[PDB]
Structure formats: C-alpha cells, structure tokens
Write a protein that binds this ligand. Structure first.
Ligand SMILES: Cc1cc2nc3c(=O)[nH]c(=O)nc-3n(C[C@H](O)[C@H](O)[C@H](O)COP(=O)(O)OP(=O)(O)OC[C@H]3O[C@@H](n4cnc5c(N)ncnc54)[C@H](O)[C@@H]3O)c2cc1C
Ligand SMILES: Cc1cc2nc3c(=O)[nH]c(=O)nc-3n(C[C@H](O)[C@H](O)[C@H](O)COP(=O)(O)OP(=O)(O)OC[C@H]3O[C@@H](n4cnc5c(N)ncnc54)[C@H](O)[C@@H]3O)c2cc1C
Ligand SMILES: *CC1=C(CCCCCC(=O)O)C(=O)c2ccccc2C1=O
Ligand SMILES: *CC1=C(CCCCCC(=O)O)C(=O)c2ccccc2C1=O
Lengths: 461, 461
C-alpha cells in the first residue's frame, strides 16, 4: 500500500486548497477525484453562474440603452453563443489549474474513494489501497430532488446541474425553491427572456436572511417580471404535447387550499436544497459520525469523531460557500503540518453575496439574531432606502436598501445587510471592518466617497 | 445694518452644509450666493459629471453586447437627449434640497459679496451691509485658464464649466491637463464618440497618485482610444473655417522639440487646475491671510487669522472634494454652536475615487510617500493584476490592478490603490478599515466573497 502524509478525498475547493497548502509545508500528499478537478465551484457553481449573471445584467443594459441617448437594440438573445463561450472558459480554468497541482508535486488519484476496514486509516480506489496518518474528507454535495413516491413525475424536472447543461433558452420556466440558488436561477432565466415563475412554500424568499432583505428581494423579483407563487407546492408533474404540466397546490393562510395546473412548461428546475456526498464512503467501517442528513460531524478544528480523519466544505453542511471550504482547508493544513494547534476557521462574520437583481450583500447578524443575543433593549438599527443615481435618467428602476445592526452602548456594528446596484463589490471592505469590531463611530468618522451608493453606509442617520 | 448669528459667503457644499446645520443647532444664519445655489457639486461638478460618466460607461459596455450573445447594437449617441435629462435631474435635486433649506430658515442673499473696513467683521452686498459674530468664507474656486499674454487665443477654449453647457457632441476634442478632472472629461468625450486627445506636460497622467495608478491609467486611456500627447504644451490657438487650430510644442527627453498644428478641433478644454475665488473679496481690507495662490489660510479648526472669520472647502486649497467641504463645514457649525474643543475634520486617510475607465480608488499613502515616512526598510507592498471575469467572453479588455502598502513589523495598512471594474463602489469599506488602523492580518483574516474582484484585496500574497 502506498503511504502518504496527507490523503484528500475530493478535488474541489476544500480538498485542493488543503492539499496545496500541506504540500507547501512539505507534506507528501495525494488528491482523489472521481470526476472533474475543480469540483462544484468551476464546473457547475460559482464561476459559470457568475458568467450567466453577467449575461443577464447585459440584458438589463439593453433595456436602458434608449434612455441613455442611444437607438434601441433588438433583443434576440442567443443562449447557444454564451453557452459555448462559458464552456470554453471553464475548460481553460480546468487546464490552467491542473498545472498547479503538478507544480505543487501533488499526486492525483483518479477514481472513487472509499474507506477500508483496516484498523489503520486506509482508503481504496478502484482496487488499490492508500494510507496516511491524516485523511481529509472533502467530497462536497449535490442537488436535492424529490422522490417519485412523494411527487410523481419529479424526475421530469432538472436541477442546477441540468441548468448548466442547457443549450437553449427555455420559453417557460418554473423554479421551485426560496433559497439563494433558486433566486439566482429565476433571475437569470427571467432577465434573458424566459417567462418565469418562482414557487415558494411561504410568503417571501430568503427567509433565513434579515427581514429587510427577505422582503425587498421578493418585491424586486416581482418588479423584474418573475411571478412569485406564494404558499405553493408541487403535487405532480406530467408530460404534455407542448412540454410539461405542473400540478400545484396553493394554501394561503386564512384561505382555502386550491389546485392549479400550470401548462406549457419547458423547464422545471428543482432548487430545494443540497445533500452531502457521503453515502458510498463506507463511513461505517470506521464508525465515522454523521447526522440524519448524511453530513459528516466535526468539531471546531474540523476533526471527525475518528483520530486522523477530518472533513471540510459542503460535506459538513455548514456555511456552504467556496471561500469557506478553502479557508477551512488551509487552516487545517497549518494545524497538521506546521503544528499550529490554534489554527482553525472562525465561522463568525463570514460575508456572502447573492447574485440577484440587484445583488445582495450581508455579513454578521440579522436584526432578529442580534435582538436574541444582546436583548431587544440593547439593539439599535439604522437603515435607509433610495434610488441609485444610475436610474436618474431611466424609466426602469431598482432601489437600494441598507441596514446596519448595532449592539450595546458603543453601538458595535454586528450586522450589515443590503441590496442594490454595486452591492456585490461593496461588501468585502465593510466585512473587514466588522471582523475588526468596528462601531458606528468608526463608520461615521470615515469620509464619504461622492457620488456613490457606498457612501450611504458611512452617513446613516 | 442687517445682522445675523452666522453669516456664510457662498452657496456651495461647504457653505450650505455649515449654514444648514447651524440653523439646526438653533443658530441664526444666512447665506450669500452670486450665482446658482448648490454650488459646484450639483451644477458643474460631482453630480452632472457622474451622470455623464454613467452614460459613457453604458456606451463602453454595449460594445460587448454581441460578445454576450445579443445582436450587435448601433451607437449613434444623441448628446442633446442626455443633456436635457441631466438638467431635469439636477432641477429635481435643487427643488428637493430647497425644501430642506427654507425649512431650516436660512436667509439667502443674492449678489456678489465683499468685505469692508469696519473695526468689526462686516460685509457688503449690492450696497447693503450685513454682519454677524461668525462669518464663514466658502466661496470655492473656479477653473484656471491661460492668459492671452501667455497663450494667444486661449480664450477660444472652454473649461469644465463650459463642458456642462455643451448641447452637442464635439466631433474632435483636445483636453489639456493631467489631473483627475482632465482624465474624467477625456474619458467621457472619447467613450461617447469624440475623436479625443489628452495633452500632458510629462509622460503619464495623475502623477500625484501612486506610481502604479499613474502608469496604469495612462495605459488604459490609450487602450480606450484617447490619444495621449506626452511632453506637449499649447503655444497658440487660432480660429479656422472648420473650428480651431491648436499649435503645440512637443519636447520628449532625448529628442528634438517639434511644433505641431492640430487642425479641425471642435472643442479645446482647459483642465490645468483651479484657482480659489478670493480676487474680489477685498479680504485685504481686514488683513485676512492668504497664500500666493489666493487660498485662505486656516488652522485645524478652520480658523482664519482674524477672530470671528473662518473658511472651509475649495477656497482653502486642501483636499478639494465635496464630502470634505461638507464635513469640515458641519464640524465647524459644531464647534461654534456645540462647544467641543476637539471638534474638527480629520484630514488623514480621506478616500477618493476618480471616475476614469475603469474607475480608480485610493486611500492613504502612495508607496513612495510611505517609504519616506517609515523608511524603505519598514515598508512592504503587495500587489496584483488580473483581467476581471466579466471579460472572459469579450474581445475588448480592461485590467484590474491593486496595491496594498504596509508599514512596520505588524504590516499596518497605510495605503490601498486600485483601478478596475467596480472599484468605485469597492473602496468605501476598505477606507473604514484603514481609518481603524487595520493590519494585513485583519484583511487576511476576513473571508473572501467569491466570485468578485474585491476578494483579491483580502487574498494578497
Ligand atoms: C449553482 C450553485 C451556485 C453557487 N454559487 C456560489 C457563489 O457564488 N459563491 C460561493 O462562495 N459559493 C457558491 N456555491 C457553493 C460552492 O460552489 C460550494 O460551497 C463549494 O464548491 C464546495 O466546495 P467543496 O470542496 O466542499 O466541494 P465540491 O467542490 O463539490 O468538491 C467535492 C469533490 O469531491 C469529488 N468526490 C466526491 N466523492 C468522491 C469520492 N468518493 N472519491 C473521489 N472524489 C469524490 C466530487 O466529484 C467533487 O469534485 C454555489 C453552488 C451551486 C451548486
Ligand atoms: C468637473 C468637476 C468634477 C468633480 N467631481 C467630484 C467628485 O466626483 N467627488 C468629489 O467629492 N468632488 C468632486 N469635485 C470637487 C467638488 O465639486 C468640490 O470640492 C466642492 O464643490 C467644493 O465645495 P465648496 O463649498 O468649497 O465650493 P463651491 O461648491 O464651488 O461653492 C462656492 C459658491 O460660492 C459662490 N461664490 C463665490 N464667490 C462669491 C461671492 N463673492 N459672493 C457670493 N457668492 C460667491 C459660488 O458662485 C458658488 O456657488 C469636482 C469638481 C469639478 C470642477
Ligand atoms: C473556486 C475555484 C476552483 C476550485 C478550487 C480550490 C482550489 C484551491 C487551491 O488551490 O487552493 C478552481 O480549481 C479554479 C481554477 C482556475 C480559475 C478559478 C477557479 C475557482 O474559482
Ligand atoms: C454635493 C451636493 C449638494 C451641494 C451641498 C451641501 C448640501 C449639504 C447639507 O445641507 O447638508 C446639494 O445641494 C444636493 C441636493 C440634492 C441631491 C444631491 C446633492 C449633492 O450631492
């Protein structure tokens, strides 16, 4: 059996980040990947999603062209064109990167890995055994789809994975879900020309976000032309002559249930959650702990319940973002190969951007979370809403809302929430300030940059 | 004679800001304006400039419309259309603000103001004399134009003031200057279709900015189609049958000087600097101190050399920005009506954005300034350059450059400099962090937001 200092299962964001840092510290490592190196981020997540978002934004530009003094443009979008360019970009990334694994002298093991019953930490790929005193599980996850038994015909729908396989613009789309992936997909499809509906179980999207964001985002979706079907769930899906027929039940509180048949649907996209990839790792052979969802259980140092075995990224079910998987992986490498016992990722104040229209930026606690932690008596919030200057000459409008959540006497900034033009690139710097424990005084004592939307955050009344 | 509790000369950003708050604090102030209320910010500066920049940005992105999968869009810009909408927008702004002015009860005196003798601070406007225990001078400045004795025919050219009076797109434009106003005007004109040249005295633009920015900005201007005329100065201007003829002398080090006659110029714009408005204030009658340039000298509390008289804004020649004039003005009305010996604007680490293409963001010290203040041995810089993923599918390209200047062993961040897409809305948050005395560790400890350009600043190595 081949022996290494570090074995990483999964060549995605978390695995590659941890493997490369370990190698820089001298560790002899190998990465096991059953599919495409790069994982979800480059192949069916972050990167291709952003390219499609940039495309959707270009559609918004086409619409304001006349208002800005130019002759109107046609508007016939060609999905095939961007699809081909997007695929080429992903190919370049996959190539330019594989080179990095080579430069780091990290061995790549192609195939599906599974733990062996060997008393010593050992895995098997294809038919060969590999071992090491340190083994990292970074297998990520996958999109969740309903069972045929629960919702007959569910298999007729696609997920975000299928979204990236599309070669043409669906004429009519129905997205099921209220999370950020559901919101991003609905926004992109609608902006590019698809007659889009977003089906949600309650009254608003992004219910885990601050109330202001949940409310505002739902309203902007409706203003953009996305039909938000509230308190609705899919009961059945059936193939028709034109496409698919979606049977929906709407149960609004205070009203009676009603069934609706949505016809002529070209694309039914399920965006109801993610499930971890742990089913076939033979975790039981070592007694590796997981929850009833399949997530690997870990402590603050990413240790599983078994010595010498760790886990990071989507597989653990906490803060499912690329930079998080990367940071957790690198912090672990320093702990194991630089012997920094205190090296770990701080999961507090992790910033996130949702690429909606306009984009959302948030970091820290929501107003409700702050109230629960410090007591309503010790929480003070500042907020504002305005129409960005960009829309001064356009008929089409979007608004910008910002909220600052402060705690205690010194009004420590414990949360920042916003949606509006430019919020995607505006958040990072404010996140650094929040991580530093900035107070509102720190914000107010920073001179504003005029004229921008960002200056509103340092001039809150 | 008319008497008030606070007299303010100038109805601009610094004047209105101080007076408006003065009224708020229960003060009894009045403001004298010889021209349009609001000042440079709303009439011939910040706001209208940004509307024109947004228009230019629109035009630039639309050149990538076909690359993003849409049918090519023509680009015959109609200047008159935007001019009218811009004027209307400014009108709505003045009205909204005017409602807040009359609300705080502030007497507006029309006419050119000028000081008189009197053993006590007194001013006369159109024959009528006014006075008060506190007089604020906030007359701002104006564009500088060469004297006919120096450059014959110089009066044939316009300045930024005239730029905002333009009702048609000049076919051929020549902008003279290397500062940010010159850079912004050249970029807007060229983006909108004018055959544009930018004449500078040396090799690069923005020489007072960090070397990386000066170099990069000059290159981006050339890549955008702006002809940068280096080591060149205007000697004479003459009216011709088809516009203007600009006589220029070019003297590149190592080469022989040469005379060039630029024909068929439709618009010659002087952007060689600004001078303070104090030539007709008769401040000599009261011994008010000024420098050789005409700037009113003041201390940290904006006090002139004559008790009871203060000055803020562009007229003082330091940090010529709207938020600085506003803040200094508020901090003053604060001191004179709140009694806080420590109340004054901190002029350190003021952030600024230059609306070039792409935009520039900077705060803190340049690498050279830091090297001189801390010593080469105590300064370390981190920098990166990349092509934003927005261009992954476009033939046209712009780059993004970022530089972090650190000082001493803890690597305190004393400067951040960058140019690229989104940098205009990206800077504010980082400025808050720098003002807080953030170190590189603080930046690196903040989790990145992917995929964005802003995350590159927290992952520099
Ligand atoms: C549509 C979509 C949009 C998103 N947008 C964003 C965004 O804008 N920003 C952001 O920060 N995050 C975003 N995310 C989330 C981000 O992509 C994930 O958090 C990140 O990819 C997780 O990294 P990971 O390393 O845990 O797993 P993954 O990158 O999924 O990698 C796990 C790898 O392990 C391999 N593997 C699994 N089992 C085995 C085995 N037994 N043997 C060998 N190899 C195996 C897989 O094939 C895979 O390559 C998005 C996700 C989706 C789905
Ligand atoms: C083209 C251009 C673009 C700019 N872009 C930006 C930008 O994007 N961001 C930024 O922060 N800054 C920008 N600035 C700078 C900003 O506009 C100025 O810093 C700010 O307006 C200065 O405010 P102020 O109150 O000192 O003077 P001003 O606003 O110039 O006001 C002085 C007022 O006093 C009046 N006045 C003068 N003399 C007398 C007198 N004797 N009696 C009565 N009234 C008198 C004037 O007519 C005027 O209205 C720009 C400037 C220009 C020229
Ligand atoms: C998110 C992403 C990935 C997955 C990577 C984590 C790799 C980390 C490391 O080495 O520390 C890529 O593989 C990749 C490749 C080229 C360009 C962009 C990207 C990504 O954004
Ligand atoms: C820059 C600006 C100005 C100039 C003024 C100072 C106003 C300050 C204060 O009273 O506190 C405006 O007058 C104005 C009016 C409406 C909308 C925007 C603006 C500006 O950006």
């Amino acid at each position: 059996v081949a022996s290494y200092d570090y074995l990483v299962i999964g060549g995605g964001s978390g695995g590659l980040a941890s493997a490369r840092r370990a190698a820089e510290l001298g560790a002899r490592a190998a990465v096991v990947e059953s599919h495409k190196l790069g994982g979800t981020c480059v192949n069916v997540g972050c990167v291709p999603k952003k390219v499609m978002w940039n495309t959707a934004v270009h559609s918004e530009f086409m619409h304001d062209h006349a208002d800005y003094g130019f002759p109107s443009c046609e508007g016939k979008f060609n999905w095939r064109v961007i699809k081909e360019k997007r695929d080429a970009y992903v190919s370049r990334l996959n190539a330019i990167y594989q080179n990095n694994l080579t430069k780091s002298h990290i061995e790549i093991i192609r195939g599906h890995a599974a733990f062996t019953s060997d008393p010593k930490p050992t895995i098997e790929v294809s038919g060969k055994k590999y071992t090491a005193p340190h083994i990292l599980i970074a297998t990520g996850g996958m999109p969740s789809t309903p069972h045929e038994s629960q919702i007959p015909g569910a298999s007729l729908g696609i997920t975000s994975d299928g979204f990236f396989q599309l070669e043409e613009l669906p004429g009519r789309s129905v997205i099921v879900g209220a999370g950020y992936i559901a919101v991003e997909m609905a926004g992109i499809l609608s902006a590019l020309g698809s007659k889009t509906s977003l089906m949600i179980r309650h009254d608003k999207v992004l219910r885990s976000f601050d109330s202001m964001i949940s409310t505002n985002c739902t309203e902007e979706l409706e203003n953009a032309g996305v039909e938000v079907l509230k308190f609705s769930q899919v009961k059945e899906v059936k193939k028709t002559l034109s496409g698919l027929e979606v049977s929906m039940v709407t149960a609004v509180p205070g009203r009676l249930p009603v069934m609706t048949m949505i016809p002529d649907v070209d694309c039914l996209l399920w965006a109801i959650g993610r499930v971890p990839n742990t089913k076939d790792l033979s975790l039981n052979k070592l007694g590796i702990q997981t929850d009833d969802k399949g997530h690997i259980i870990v402590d603050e140092f990413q240790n599983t319940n078994v010595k010498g075995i760790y886990a990071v990224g989507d597989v653990c079910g906490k803060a499912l973002l690329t930079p998080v998987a990367i940071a957790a992986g690198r912090k672990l490498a320093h702990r194991l190969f630089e012997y920094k016992e205190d090296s770990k990722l701080d999961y507090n104040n992790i910033p996130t951007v949702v690429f909606s229209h306009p984009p959302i930026g948030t970091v820290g606690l929501t107003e409700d979370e702050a109230i629960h932690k410090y007591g309503i008596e010790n929480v003070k919030t500042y907020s504002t809403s305005f129409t960005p200057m960009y829309h001064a000459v356009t008929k089409r409008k979007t608004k910008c809302v910002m909220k600052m959540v402060c705690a205690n006497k010194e009004e420590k900034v414990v949360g920042i929430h916003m949606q509006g033009l430019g919020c995607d690139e505006m958040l990072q710097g404010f996140a650094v300030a929040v991580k530093m424990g900035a107070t509102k005084a720190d914000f107010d004592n920073t001179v504003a940059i005029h004229p921008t939307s960002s200056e509103e955050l340092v001039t809150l009344r």
